[PDB]
Amino acid sequence: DISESLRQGGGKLNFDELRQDLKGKGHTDAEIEAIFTKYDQDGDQELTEHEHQQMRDDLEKEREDLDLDHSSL
């Protein structure tokens, strides 16, 4: 979605499919694997249609207040 390849370029975001968008980016996949864990919208990356149905990236919008305590984890 940030760049436009094809389905990944505008549609759904996946780890392995994210590569489609940024194919050639990264040295090792583990580096990308590391970043998605905290910084992906759902912290998943390999997501199909959930993100797509929103049409708008809800990650960018920090509408909800991230509290200190979030109950468990």
Side-chain angles (χ1 to χ4, degrees):
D1 287 83
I2 181 280
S3 307
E4 186 182 81
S5 46
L6 186 62
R7 41 162 58 197
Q8 188 61 211
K12 83 297 281 64
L13 296 306
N14 302 211
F15 178 84
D16 182 72
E17 208 181 276
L18 174 72
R19 316 298 266 113
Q20 179 167 147
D21 201 58
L22 42 66
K23 301 195 66 183
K25 174 280 166 66
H27 294 255
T28 49
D29 295 85
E31 302 173 272
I32 307 182
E33 183 185 279
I35 182 279
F36 79 69
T37 301
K38 179 62 200 63
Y39 305 95
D40 178 84
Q41 73 174 212
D42 188 64
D44 193 90
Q45 208 174 270
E46 278 189 274
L47 295 170
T48 312
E49 311 310 89
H50 309 103
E51 330 74 66
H52 198 338
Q53 58 86 270
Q54 302 159 149
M55 293 298 181
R56 304 166 60 216
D57 178 48
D58 196 64
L59 177 62
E60 180 183 62
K61 300 176 294 185
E62 300 187 88
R63 46 176 174 151
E64 305 186 282
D65 178 63
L66 189 166
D67 193 79
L68 191 168
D69 173 271
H70 300 265
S71 300
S72 303
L73 300 76

